[PDB]
Symmetry: D2
């Protein structure tokens, strides 16, 4: 169950009963740049800190981002999280990511390269994401 919704600049987060946060929406009209440096934590109205463990379903859908850092607090990237981000060319994934859900980078056709962290256990076939993604690299543990 959602405990509260917190807005941090262009980011909307939902805080759950289990003490984790999901990044539910990126609002490009509120962003200071096209590089999304996603925070690893979010603080509620009472000063309690929660880790950002999930990039929610369609959170960045159809946004103008050119680059993104997914912090090491994130365990899962949701379905269509970065779908139709037509200018997205630089994706930094971090060691602790376990799951990359279906079509997480659907039609990110400016994405030419991606490196998968050693921690990833299950992902959607990454070659479905971008028409320009010829090769996928895997980080060694």
């Amino acid at each position: 169950v959602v405990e509260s919704t917190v807005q941090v600049g262009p980011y909307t987060f939902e805080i759950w009963f289990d003490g984790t946060a999901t990044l539910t929406r990126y609002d490009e009209s509120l962003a200071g740049s096209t590089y999304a440096d996603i925070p690893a934590s979010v603080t509620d109205e009472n000063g309690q800190e929660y880790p950002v463990t999930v990039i929610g379903e369609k959170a960045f859908e159809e946004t103008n981002i050119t680059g993104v850092t997914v912090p090491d607090s994130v365990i899962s990237i949701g379905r269509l999280a970065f779908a139709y981000c037509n200018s997205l060319s630089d994706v930094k994934l971090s060691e602790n990511l376990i799951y990359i859900n279906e079509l997480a980078f659907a039609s990110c056709d400016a994405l030419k390269e991606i490196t998968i962290p050693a921690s990833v256990e299950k992902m959607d076939n990454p070659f479905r994401w971008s028409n320009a993604l010829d090769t996928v690299y895997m980080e060694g543990m």
Copy 2:
């Protein structure tokens, strides 16, 4: 970077042994196989009894064959271009730790292939699953 020293036939498998001391699986001949499961040998012996590791699955080695399953042994470092392409009955692929490279379209248009597990040793993949309809999910082996 090398030259073929000898060609060896082991049942349905053709191997080329290179002067660098490694062997490439160049062809799978269906008509000589005992079953549709390809249990690829990790090594091949030449006419003088010398043993060589099978380090590469050659380009198109299993192209359009009737295989239902395959074990790629721990001796293999790379899987060549279209090595298992258009294998419409292939549903079970065992990759082993030591594989580094999966070349372009290596498992292309394999319509019965629904999943694959990638070993922790794999460093690079050139779109090996293009046109393989049911290949949604990729699992990754931990170290």
Copy 3:
């Protein structure tokens, strides 16, 4: 270039009426439907009783719905972006005989769609079937 005159609800269907005298189907609400077959009306009546043709299936109108089949009536000229995307039970699509354009990803990631018949009137399609990997064959009436 037009403006929305009014919005009309007809069972599970939401329509926008434009000043050019046409209607766009903007949303399909699963919870208001009597069945999983979407028999889209060819016309819609506004609050003053005026009938208008349904000429467009709007962007994402049926996105992620439970529909198993759809009839796109002969009044429809264009199917919008992602109009039927992610409809994983959709297997039967009857398209409009006046359909001219099928916009980008209109039938994307529809994993149960195995075939489609394209009407002779269609002039242009912007990759409508991306990620619908069971969609092998496309039929046309021909000569």
Copy 4:
């Protein structure tokens, strides 16, 4: 006798009086433009319409453009597969069937026009990573 060579083109001639283009040999071609002949003649001067582009006929060749003449009824499986420089395909007009992966990995192909005669084809969006739009001629 049942095989005819016309420059870079090999044709197999059938009992039913039709011909299949079985192979394109780029080392024998005068250019990278494959203007496929609509007919082929045997040693006795009998003319055979070219009705089929055979399976893998142009596989991995250097062609930059192709005209498939109005005599062709079917394009075979992987006929133009891995033709990495192919950017212009003219289909004519009598074509009925386009078999599986006829233009597989023809990733320099940005648009294609499908003739009104085509009745059944492999999804053309599978062929090229650069093919955003398919046009249908009336």
